[PDB]
Amino acid sequence: HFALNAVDRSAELQGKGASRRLRKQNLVPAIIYGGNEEPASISIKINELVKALEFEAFFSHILTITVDGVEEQAVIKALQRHPAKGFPMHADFQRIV
Amino acid sequence: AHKKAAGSSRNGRDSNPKMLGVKIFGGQAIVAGNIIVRQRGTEFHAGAGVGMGRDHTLFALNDGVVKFATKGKFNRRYVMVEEA
Amino acid sequence: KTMKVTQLKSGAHRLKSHKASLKGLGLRRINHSVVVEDTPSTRGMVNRVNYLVKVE
Amino acid sequence: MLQPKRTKFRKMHKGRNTGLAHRGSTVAFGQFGLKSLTRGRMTARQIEAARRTITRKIKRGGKIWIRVFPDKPISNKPLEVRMGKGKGPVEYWVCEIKPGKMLYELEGISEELAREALTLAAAKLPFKTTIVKRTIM
Amino acid sequence: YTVVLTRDKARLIEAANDRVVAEFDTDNAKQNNMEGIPFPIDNNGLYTTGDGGSDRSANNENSYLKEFFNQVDKSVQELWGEHKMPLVIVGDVRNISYYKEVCDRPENIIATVSNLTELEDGN
RNA sequence: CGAAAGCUAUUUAGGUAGCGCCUCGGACGAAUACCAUUGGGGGUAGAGCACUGUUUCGGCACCGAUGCAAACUCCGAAUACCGAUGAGUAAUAUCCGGGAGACACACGGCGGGUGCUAACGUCCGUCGUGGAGAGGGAAACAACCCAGACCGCCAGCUAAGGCCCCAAAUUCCUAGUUAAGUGGGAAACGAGGUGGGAAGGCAUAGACAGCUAGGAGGUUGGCUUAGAAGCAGCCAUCCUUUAAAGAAAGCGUAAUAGCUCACUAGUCGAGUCGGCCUGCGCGGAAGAUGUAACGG
RNA sequence: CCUCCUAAAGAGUAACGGAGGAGUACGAAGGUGCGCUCAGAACGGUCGGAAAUCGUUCAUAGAGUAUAAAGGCAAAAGCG
RNA sequence: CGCUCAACGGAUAAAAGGUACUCUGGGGAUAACAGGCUGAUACCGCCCAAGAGUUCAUAUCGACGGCGGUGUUUGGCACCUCGAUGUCGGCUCAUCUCAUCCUAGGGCUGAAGCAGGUCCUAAGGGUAUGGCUGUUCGCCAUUUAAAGAGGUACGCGAGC
């Protein structure tokens, strides 16, 4: 319930057109920032994130992002969803310590 | 004109343009007497090398290069004429 | 070094600066090909009209 | 019939309703909301009709919030009047609605009956609407 | 309701039995939020003022009267929707005729009087 | 070679004049244009509530949540504009003089005012086209798309657009969708059309549907009302026999009565139910000489 | 004729577009040197209060600027 | 120094009107008719369903609101015509549409019957005469199965 799988988002999938083209692949951009090191840009599958968001305790508990290997303890801080269609569009995660 | 709606509201006046604004921009060559800024009030202040007229016109007091800078405790926009 | 630039579409009805970028590359009509030095200043002229031209 | 109190200018420029409602797109007051999916003008008569419908359906047992206020004066020329001769008089007041906007929220009442009250209210409105619940993020 | 018609104007009165309830003038609540012309309605047609793009040799006067009475009926229906009482049409026989052909809810008409005097000035 | 339908002024507004735009001659010669890098100022799009207003809710004008504004701004782009440096390309720029024409513009995009985000409307700004531009396409169609006609050719390649026949070129290939001639007019809204996708609920401790039996007792809950007996309305949703049965989801009565339902047990035997999103469809859809809303 | 907006962040830019002003004033309300700082709120105080004058404490200006508006104004351009 | 020369680049120091008695040069650069574009308004239809209907939203009607269709009223524009496109009504003669007035077939009904009310299908035929007024219309009298709504340059004056 509190573990989600993610993939790396490199510099070529970053930007306006790249984010739009990535959301057309059923993916949600997200940034993991905080802790004591640089932020990491990841991509989370849209259906996985929607299911995770259905749980109301998902917003106030420690989450585990597994980026195909390296794993991070995080807390969701911001979630921008579509103003009208309502689907999630970008996620912020704060690395806990 | 069935609903008594359309009626007198007379305002078709406007003054002539004044052609204000920056005349010489930053980094440009300037000779003494050249007007840099035409303005209402001190939107820009005269720093070193530029004077101010009675209508707050900023003009070059000497030859050089026009420099714009924000400086002082009031964060005022200043225009200078540096001897470059 | 140089590069070959060909004109594909007509430049007759383009913006003034796009016409000027064509002429500054040396292109004069459709299917006209010129060889010009491959420097950033010429590559910006190609970029300005990239819909109009192709680079070999 | 909502209407601004004293205003600064009698008449306003037409303007352009463009973009999404990035503000006012969240159920922020109640538990339950009716959101616009399309853009348009929400006339004060439409606001009042959809408010009377909701109130009559919830029956003094819940709370309703209105997130749209008609603050844009809309002028109209009378019939048989030629073009020109100044801008017409103000006749009504609209709100500019963008896709995503909350229009009404309900709180303190059953979800089923709040759903049908908002469904009744949507029938008076010139918008394609969706019915949304209040979320955390 | 009493709808008083004239080629130049329309008046609306609310009447209880044999007394006037109200006159529907500028100072009323029922005409505050109106999408139509409030009573008393003047016939300020383009033909009445002599401009607008019409000629007297076109013989459009009857059509103009019909459309004016149609606008009058629009105001009457707007006011009646909030109260829903039967109406009596007062006026010339021809005016009553035009109004009856133009009325949007002619089933609510209960009486027509054409021998009433001083339609424009009488109280 | 090649405009203009602009600005300013005008007893001016369909006239005229200076300037702008055209041409010819002369001078000058890169001072010009494009692009790269780079020095500038801005208050626009966006955004926001710090000011001027305006707005909703809560607590108590002030605090907190929450919106909005041409004549609001704590902010703030892209472009554009003004400079510098530098390459390449280019029939540049500037000035003096001879000759003008023009000062009714139009449409299509973009940003607005006005109008009704009406108009082949009107008024500006800016780009393109026409004007003054033929050729190909859009059936036909100044202003749209492609493209700028020196002349000749019974040569070839392409652009927009097309390739079943009229009519030149695929009855071409691959995977799907539609059944409406949709394609080839029209919305709110309605529906059990159909395809796809994320999740769910129930199920051989017999799921969904049907059928069989029950669906009850305080109690006609209290109030209200002529009457309000589950079922006009207002105020609770309690208990009991229970396998189960709502102080009732409908029909019904003036009110009762009565018929169902929810729910449970039995029979049968395998998958089933309802929301969400997405593609293409259906209805909504009535006009005047003749099919007549794919040119056929 | 002036100010704002329209006016699309240089200038300019139209409509019988949306809003307001001007056809003056002043020998000091000009020059200079010198000096000063406003509006409001709260508290205390004779008449005297919501508000006069006095004292205290907060107070970049929420004032003033001869006048419309805009832009400015602490070296005040405000006040002696 | 002397201008509300304020029509403010200021025609003269010095200046109002009428014309249906009229006239010329021009303009479809610009109005009245009719066409076109548009559809605010209008008319027609549909969506929601507060309510009325003794009870009962949906037999019938439909408050507050919403969405369309038509070109059809009142308008907007100024594209065509000013080297001329004759106006309203009547007469004569029509032709088309269907949103149907009668006749035909139906569903629902607050449809017992007889009569109706609504809506669906339906355009084959048919669909008064008079009094008043220039009237179209309208009112009225008397009928009829019915006395339809419209388009056609508000059809039709080189037909009256």
Add this chain to the structure above:
RNA sequence: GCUGACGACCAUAGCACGAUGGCACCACCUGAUCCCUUCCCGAACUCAGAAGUGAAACAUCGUCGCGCCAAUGGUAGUGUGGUUUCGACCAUGUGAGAGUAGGUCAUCGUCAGCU
């Protein structure tokens, strides 16, 4: 090490709160004869001085309570070319504001004085 003068800079430099400082310096402080002040007032300005005190002010030090600064990512907008059902979308180039993580109780220059 500290103090004062004049600057750079103009909130990451500010506010608030607390602590330290009197040997030099600074500040209060004493007096009002004299210079010079007050539309009245030694308050301020000014002069003549060191009895007292670091109380206030000031300077320094400490902090994150407020302020202020502030990414990354995403979003909005946008030049050019194309498409469009006019909402927008695609390619390319740019790219905010708000918000979040976070940072901040400044940093320097010239001269003089005490140590």
